[PDB]
Amino acid sequence: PEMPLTEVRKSHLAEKKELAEREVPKLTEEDMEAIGARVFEFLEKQKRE
Amino acid sequence: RQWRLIETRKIAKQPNYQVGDAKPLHMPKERKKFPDYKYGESNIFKQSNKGLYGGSFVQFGNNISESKAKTRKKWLPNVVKKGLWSETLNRKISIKMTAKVLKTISKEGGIDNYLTKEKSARIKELGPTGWKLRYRVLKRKDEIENPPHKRRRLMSFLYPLEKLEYRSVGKDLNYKKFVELFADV
Amino acid sequence: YKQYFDSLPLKLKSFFQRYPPSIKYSPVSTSTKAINANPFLPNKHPVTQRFHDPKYSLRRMSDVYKLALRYGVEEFLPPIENTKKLFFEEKYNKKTLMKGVLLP
RNA sequence: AAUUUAAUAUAACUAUUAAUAGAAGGUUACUAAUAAAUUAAUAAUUAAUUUUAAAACCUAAAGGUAAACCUUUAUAUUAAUAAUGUUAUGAAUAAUUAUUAAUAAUAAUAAACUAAGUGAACUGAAACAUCUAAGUAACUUAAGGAUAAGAAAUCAACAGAGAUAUUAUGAGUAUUGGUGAGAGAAAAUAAUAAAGGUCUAAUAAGUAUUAUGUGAAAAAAAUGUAAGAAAAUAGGAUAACAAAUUCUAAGACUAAAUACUAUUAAUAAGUAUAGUAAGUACCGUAAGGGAA
RNA sequence: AAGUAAUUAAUAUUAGUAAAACAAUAAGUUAUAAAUAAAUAGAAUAAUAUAUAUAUAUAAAAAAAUAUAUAUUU
RNA sequence: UAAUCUUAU
Numbered sequence A: 001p002e003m004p005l006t007e008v009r010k011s012h013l014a015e016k017k018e019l020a021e022r023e024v025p026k027l028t029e030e031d032m033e034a035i036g037a038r039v040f041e042f043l044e045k046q047k048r049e
Numbered sequence B: 001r002q003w004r005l006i007e008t009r010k011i012a013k014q015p016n017y018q019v020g021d022a023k024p025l026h027m028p029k030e031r032k033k034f035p036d037y038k039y040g041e042s043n044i045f046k047q048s049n050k051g052l053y054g055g056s057f058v059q060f061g062n063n064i065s066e067s068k069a070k071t072r073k074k075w076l077p078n079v080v081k082k083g084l085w086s087e088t089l090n091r092k093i094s095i096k097m098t099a100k101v102l103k104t105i106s107k108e109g110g111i112d113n114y115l116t117k118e119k120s121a122r123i124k125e126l127g128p129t130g131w132k133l134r135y136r137v138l139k140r141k142d143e144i145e146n147p148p149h150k151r152r153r154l155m156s157f158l159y160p161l162e163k164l165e166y167r168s169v170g171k172d173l174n175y176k177k178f179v180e181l182f183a184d185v
Numbered sequence C: 001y002k003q004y005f006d007s008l009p010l011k012l013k014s015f016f017q018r019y020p021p022s023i024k025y026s027p028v029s030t031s032t033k034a035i036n037a038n039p040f041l042p043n044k045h046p047v048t049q050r051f052h053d054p055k056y057s058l059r060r061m062s063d064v065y066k067l068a069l070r071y072g073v074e075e076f077l078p079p080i081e082n083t084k085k086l087f088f089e090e091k092y093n094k095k096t097l098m099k100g101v102l103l104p
Numbered sequence D: 001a002a003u004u005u006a007a008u009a010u011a012a013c014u015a016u017u018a019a020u021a022g023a024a025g026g027u028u029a030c031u032a033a034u035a036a037a038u039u040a041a042u043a044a045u046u047a048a049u050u051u052u053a054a055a056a057c058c059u060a061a062a063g064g065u066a067a068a069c070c071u072u073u074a075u076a077u078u079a080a081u082a083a084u085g086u087u088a089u090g091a092a093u094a095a096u097u098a099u100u101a102a103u104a105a106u107a108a109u110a111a112a113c114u115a116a117g118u119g120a121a122c123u124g125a126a127a128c129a130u131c132u133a134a135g136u137a138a139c140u141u142a143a144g145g146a147u148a149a150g151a152a153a154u155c156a157a158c159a160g161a162g163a164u165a166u167u168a169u170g171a172g173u174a175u176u177g178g179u180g181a182g183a184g185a186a187a188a189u190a191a192u193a194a195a196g197g198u199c200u201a202a203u204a205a206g207u208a209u210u211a212u213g214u215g216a217a218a219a220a221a222a223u224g225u226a227a228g229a230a231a232a233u234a235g236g237a238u239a240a241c242a243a244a245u246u247c248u249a250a251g252a253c254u255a256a257a258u259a260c261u262a263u264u265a266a267u268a269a270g271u272a273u274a275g276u277a278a279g280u281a282c283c284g285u286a287a288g289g290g291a292a
Numbered sequence E: 001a002a003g004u005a006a007u008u009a010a011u012a013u014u015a016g017u018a019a020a021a022c023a024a025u026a027a028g029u030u031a032u033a034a035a036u037a038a039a040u041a042g043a044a045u046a047a048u049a050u051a052u053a054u055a056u057a058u059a060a061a062a063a064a065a066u067a068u069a070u071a072u073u074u
Numbered sequence F: 001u002a003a004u005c006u007u008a009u
């Protein structure tokens, strides 16, 4: 038989559930494009110098 | 500190048994009462399986003289028999403890508290006995918190009728069997 | 641009995926529950009031920063001000010489 | 058409490399059998995949026992019916047979490799006592196909690096030793290696640290007894202190290169006394030894 | 039925290359400079030691020791 | 003496 969860463990679980419920940070296409452009600019600058 | 002599221990990984699968050759008679303790049961200082030793195993080392003539000695922990009060169980529980463990118990403010601390270190330095004690306490706490309603009679009412129905078809039916049938329902 | 982004080293890419640059993460230590909580800083958990260790441990953070420096993607990473680490030319310039060097 | 040469077998072991995978003995008998399906290519078929029958007794752990035997009674109850004969007053009480439903059972399981516990001595030092041999042999326990380790309270040195693990150089260098016998790193650079990072923790206290007793020949991290902190404004790291630097313990997961066994393939300036029998004959009360 | 193998060190002979060798991924080992316990020192100011370098000593020499120099570096 | 410990039921 599985051992029951103590109070602290339950509270931690609840917190984790709350965290999950919130909207997750996800890397957008736009952000990637912005990064990629900056990288390209950096490469161009390196080539120049 | 570390818990090397505890967390080194490995136990045979039991395969998860499906309801429709074939039996193992040796199935036990009486069922498992307690949960499985992650770190098994100590296979060295078996003295400590019976008590709350706080992960304090026997050392072996060297007696060394003025001549530096080395001779093997052992260093036992300061074990002590001690009947300490459980608030949850409403009884005092007598066990072997290290003096260190007794000190920790005193610091934490009770024996139940000591048992139920959620840290992994505590779990490691509970014994198998300590783990069983913890389970007993925790289960009791859960019961206190949450009584069943916050069904048996209905079952008892239906049982004789069910038996009669069975008899009318042709077969006899016993209580225990009825209980087994209508556990999940 | 997308292809260039993809061509970035693995660790850096992973970091960008799981802590993206749209969120302006805090310079200072914050609540662990916060959305803008910096993964490089030790954030305090609001209930227990204990400082959690940084989500990116210090070595990993340093590696990520070096990768960003290499590919010119520093400002998209969250700030490393209040983590005590400086890096390369900035470190060289900003540091005070030891008491032993200046005053033997 | 035959002969020869080289290679290949159900039919040798050994070493290496590569690839793949993690596996029944005995006893004597009322001898311990099998049946099928689908798919492939051209009815029987061979091959692949799947299902299915039987299978005594012994091999610690149903209960015994002087292994291959004995005793338990699943060709059992318990109940419900049906058929039969007897007792006492259509109904009742016991027995036998035949259906139906309900109730439990079968440890022969590797060895090597791994981890943990305990831990010699011969021996070396041309003696011997610290030291060595050696955390070796051995015994004991526990796990997995591998285990262990592993994403820095790590190294380094004001410049920097960035899991693990194995090897080469570094280097027999630093280091250490009755400064004898002798023991001996790390950084760094190369390979091998896999996607190698990633949260699962409400961020860790009788814990760090201290005293003391022990503790891998150098290099600690451990540990019995007892005192015992701090919040990132902090904490760990070096005799010590001041500066600086670096990392975040007391919560976790992890392929891969590796070890061992077996199989298959290939290569043998290997073996015919390292070439298949036999762990037999025989020796011993026994552990055990062991032929031709 | 008895001087064998592995990991190393020092000599010698030959062969390759040679002020370089081995290795070529870098890294390393040996050589190319002698000293000194060690240190920030190190070989003709106008030539053979009568000069120079180092260690002792010193203002700098001398003094002991070893090393370095007389078209082409060994 | 509800520190400890020994015995009997």
Ligand SMILES: [Mg+2]
Binding pocket: none
């Ligand atoms: Mg048996």
Ligand SMILES: [Mg+2]
Binding pocket: D124
């Ligand atoms: Mg001797």
Ligand SMILES: [Mg+2]
Binding pocket: none
């Ligand atoms: Mg003698």
Ligand SMILES: [Mg+2]
Binding pocket: D134
């Ligand atoms: Mg030793």
Ligand SMILES: [Mg+2]
Binding pocket: none
């Ligand atoms: Mg051992």
Ligand SMILES: [Mg+2]
Binding pocket: none
């Ligand atoms: Mg593992």
Ligand SMILES: [Mg+2]
Binding pocket: none
């Ligand atoms: Mg080495």
Ligand SMILES: [Mg+2]
Binding pocket: C053, D203
């Ligand atoms: Mg942590």
Ligand SMILES: [Mg+2]
Binding pocket: C051, C053, D203
């Ligand atoms: Mg912390």
Ligand SMILES: [Mg+2]
Binding pocket: none
């Ligand atoms: Mg100590």
Ligand SMILES: [Mg+2]
Binding pocket: D183, D217
């Ligand atoms: Mg040694």
Ligand SMILES: [Mg+2]
Binding pocket: C053
């Ligand atoms: Mg951590």
Ligand SMILES: [Mg+2]
Binding pocket: none
């Ligand atoms: Mg693990």
Ligand SMILES: [Mg+2]
Binding pocket: none
């Ligand atoms: Mg005889």
Ligand SMILES: [Mg+2]
Binding pocket: none
């Ligand atoms: Mg002088």
